[PDB]
Design a protein around this ligand. Structure first.
Ligand code: SF4
Ligand code: SF4
Ligand code: FCO
Ligand code: F3S
Ligand SMILES: [Cl-]
Ligand SMILES: [Mg+2]
Ligand code: NI
Lengths: 551, 268
């Protein structure tokens, strides 16, 4: 038996330390630690409510857009403002296109090098690699010629002796299972992914004014001026340009990312039987389409003890059952006040005292829902949509299972989704369904402008006396996000962010119960404790964001 | 589904207005002709030639009577009974008047068809005139420039298709989204004009700091257009003034092809 530390964890956002006790070749106990704090909740305090979104957007530049949108929703909640429907269409297109970029970059740039051996790709036969994909994908850039050009780029990098960020990798590890040909296919798709994510961010830029960090929001709606006949504003030529980029995303997502997800599961089937982090799941509904902040295109809900048949639907961002359940504790975190706190009454008082296995070991707080630990993110999101009987989600999951069946002769049941690969699959399903969200909301905007509605902004009033509490919910790429604003005498008197990586990465809670990262690792086989690739594989499946988790 | 029909006829054209389509991105020229419209006549791209292509024009004018958009580039020459442009043995003015009879909408793409352009300048050797002068009973939509940004044309066609009418027009029948403002009333070098920071010759110190081009002959103060905002080629930052040369006034009758490059504009 022995104790290891993984510090830094790479191919994530931000600063993470993972500790593991290993006994008889398996992890017996783990600790997750966020090692950087800024105090973003304190920086935004005492300001005008209308200013918060530009400051708290900077909680994270990987999940850019998300904290901006959650912050304006929180002020609109406190103030009782109904957002114009055109402002909802624009906010929705931005969030859907951003999330497409975010999921593609996670699968390829951040996670693929846990599963893919770039050295092995030098041994591949490019023709055999291309032949393996016949009747599995219709993608137009799977030729032997494409794969030979990619293999020659790898050959040149190796021959230079400067491997840089590709160096001292896990090349030849016993947990690396792909044949040479599938390693070469994956590297070709890694490079092609960079073009698709760039198109997704061109959609975001044309509505946001730039990305990273959009600049088109307001408490009350958006800053885009809709005028089909205007010079220098959001006219029909600018809308046509947006549509030209929306139409470029589908083929890569459906014919490359969706297919690769099924192929990784076919070669790594034991990863369907490990990495369960929780038995409770939460997601919020997303993409409102009415004039009163509701009528969501995607559903939300709460699953308890993995029972889909008895789940509780969530159809409103004003649901008092959801609001009343959320608390955070700092018993095992570097803050002073330890008992569970509702976020409108939250404090964030730093109290660093160094690392202790049984005391404080993280800057991440510990969130609970009516006293229980909960997993958020794409696995939660997919399982809630299956509980709701959403036929689009059923059908997309079935397409991934059908490729896995063609490759292995085996099928995939819902029980196998509570796992490191199920989490990966839920993310892929979400990216696929978002392409229909983009087509739907573009068409809705064009049709509404044609009815003569050009409205985008309702100017707020803020009473100079009274105390007003608001909450803004959002289904972010990593899971349910909430921003909690208290207004007193016209200024922000409290501001608390509860972020999806806070739920999943937070340390042991007030009752010493284990959160999803720490739970998921128990039982992990580790062939070489000096090179713990198997631990990093499960942690990457949650898509850690530690600027998000800690703020 | 069926696509909206277009008939394109060139008169005294240089082909630059067709070539603008090969730079377009929203839509690209391949998506324009396979997805957005049915291009029923266009001599630059047509597989058919000669008697076959003249039959396919006549068949389309009948099939789509009341439905097609007619587009013309180039000026129309009236001198000596039409003979300075003859196609299939007939004056181009006769082909254009015949096609105008059944059109749902009529567009003059480029300065030549919009107001006579370079071909009508100086002594005007051929008696070249605008499309509106040849069709006095019709409302001609004018999309000037030499050539315009292609999307000034493509977004006008899209408004007709999507919303069933033309875009809003000014008193010269130009779409307001593209021609509603003077270039100098939306130019990023106006701070330099205001401060008296001027380039005096190409390659001087002010020119090499991106100062105002007024004293090089810039016609922005007297030209309506979107060249400083939409710009050209969708790469970012590309229009004549941004590259270092004054506006010549190519959009605007009486400016481009009349005033010298280095002649000073009137300022309102
Ligand atoms: S407007 Fe300019 S580009 Fe178009 S036909 Fe005339 S000379 Fe050529
Ligand atoms: S004169 Fe020309 S360069 Fe100077 S501000 Fe006016 S339009 Fe711009
Ligand atoms: N997605 C994302 Fe960032 C995290 N965790 C937020 O919200
Ligand atoms: S010469 Fe023409 S292209 Fe624009 S910058 Fe002046 S109107
Ligand atoms: Cl409008
Ligand atoms: Mg917080
Ligand atoms: Ni983030």
């Amino acid at each position: 038996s022995q104790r290891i530390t993984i510090d830094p964890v790479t191919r994530i956002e931000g600063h993470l330390r993972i500790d593991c006790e290993i006994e008889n070749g398996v992890v017996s106990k783990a600790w997750a630690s966020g090692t950087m704090w800024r105090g973003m909740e304190e920086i935004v305090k005492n300001r005008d409510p209308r200013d918060a979104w530009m400051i708290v957007q900077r909680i994270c530049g990987v999940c850019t857009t998300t904290h901006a949108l959650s912050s304006v929703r929180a002020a609109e909640s406190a103030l009782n403002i109904d957002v114009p429907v055109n402002a909802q269409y624009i906010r929705n297109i931005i969030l859907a296109a951003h999330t497409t970029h975010d999921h593609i970059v996670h699968f390829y740039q951040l996670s693929a090098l846990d599963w893919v051996d770039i050295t092995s790709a030098l041994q591949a036969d490019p023709t055999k690699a291309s032949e393996m994909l016949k009747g599995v994908s219709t993608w137009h850039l799977n030729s032997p010629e494409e794969f030979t050009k990619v293999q020659n780029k790898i050959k040149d990098l190796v021959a230079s002796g400067q491997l840089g960020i590709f160096a001292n990798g896990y090349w030849g590890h016993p947990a690396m299972k792909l044949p040479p040909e599938v390693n070469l296919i994956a590297v070709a798709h890694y490079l092609q992914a960079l073009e698709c994510q760039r198109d997704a961010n061109r959609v975001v830029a044309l509505l946001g004014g730039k990305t990273p960090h959009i600049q088109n929001l307001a408490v009350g709606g958006v800053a885009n001026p809709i005028n089909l006949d205007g010079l220098g504003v959001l006219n029909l030529e600018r809308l046509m340009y947006i549509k030209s980029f929306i139409d470029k995303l589908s083929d890569f997502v459906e014919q490359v990312y969706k297919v690769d997800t099924a192929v990784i599961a076919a070669f790594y089937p034991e990863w369907l039987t490990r990495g369960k982090g929780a038995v409770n799941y939460l997601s919020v509904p997303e993409f409102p389409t009415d004039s009163k902040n509701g009528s969501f295109l995607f559903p939300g809900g709460y699953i308890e003890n993995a029972d889909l048949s008895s789940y509780r639907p969530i159809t409103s961002h004003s649901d008092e059952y959801l609001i009343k359940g959320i608390q955070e504790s700092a018993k095992h975190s570097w803050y002073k006040d330890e008992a569970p706190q509702a976020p409108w009454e939250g404090t964030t008082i730093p109290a660093y005292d160094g690392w202790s296995d049984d005391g404080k070991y993280s800057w991440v707080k510990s969130p609970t829902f009516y006293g229980k630990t909960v997993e958020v993110g794409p696995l939660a999101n997919m399982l809630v949509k299956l509980a709701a009987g959403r036929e689009s989600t059923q059908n997309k999951l079935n397409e991934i299972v059908a490729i896995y069946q063609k490759l292995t002769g085996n099928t995939l049941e819902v029980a196998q989704l509570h796992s490191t690969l199920g989490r990966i699959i839920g993310r892929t399903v979400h990216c696929c369904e978002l392409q229909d969200i983009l087509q739907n909301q573009y068409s809705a905007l064009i049709t509404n402008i044609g009815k003569g509605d050009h409205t985008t902004f309702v100017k707020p009033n803020i009473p100079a006396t009274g105390e007003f509490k608001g909450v803004g919910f959002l289904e972010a790429p990593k899971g349910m996000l909430s921003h909690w604003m208290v207004i007193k005498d016209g200024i922000i008197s409290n501001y608390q962010a509860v972020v999806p990586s806070t739920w999943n990465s937070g340390p042991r809670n007030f009752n010493d119960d284990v959160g999803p990262y720490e739970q998921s690792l128990v039982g992990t086989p580790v062939a070489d404790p000096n090179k713990p690739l198997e631990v990093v594989r499960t942690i990457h499946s949650f898509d850690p964001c530690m600027a998000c988790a800690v703020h | 589904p069926q696509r909206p029909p277009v008939i394109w006829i060139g008169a005294q054209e240089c082909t630059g207005c067709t070539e603008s389509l090969l730079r377009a991105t929203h839509p690209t020229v391949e998506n324009l002709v396979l997805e957005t419209i049915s291009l029923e006549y266009h001599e630059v791209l047509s597989a058919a030639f000669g008697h076959q292509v003249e039959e396919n024009k006549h068949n389309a004018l009948e099939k789509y009577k009341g439905q097609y958009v007619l587009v013309v580039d180039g000026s129309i020459p009236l001198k000596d009974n039409g003979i300075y442009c003859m196609v299939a043995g007939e004056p181009i003015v006769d082909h254009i008047r015949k096609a105008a009879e059944g059109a749902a909408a009529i567009i003059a793409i480029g300065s030549c068809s919009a107001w006579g352009g370079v071909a009508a300048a100086g002594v005007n050797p051929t008696g070249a005139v605008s499309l509106q002068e040849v069709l006095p009973g019709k409302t001609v939509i004018n999309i000037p420039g030499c050539p315009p940004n292609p999307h000034n044309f493509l977004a006008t066609v899209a408004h007709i298709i999507t919303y069933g009418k033309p875009p809003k027009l000014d008193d010269k029948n130009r779409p307001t989204f593209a021609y509603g403002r003077l270039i100098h009333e939306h130019c990023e070098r106006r701070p330099h004009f205001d401060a008296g920071r001027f380039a005096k010759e190409f390659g001087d110190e002010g020119h090499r700091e991106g100062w105002c081009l007024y004293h090089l002959g810039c016609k922005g103060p007297e030209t309506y257009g979107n060249c400083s905002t939409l710009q050209f080629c969708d790469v970012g930052g590309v229009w004549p003034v941004a590259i270092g040369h004054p506006c010549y006034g190519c959009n605007e009758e009486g400016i481009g092809f009349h005033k010298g490059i280095h002649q000073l504009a009137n300022v309102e």
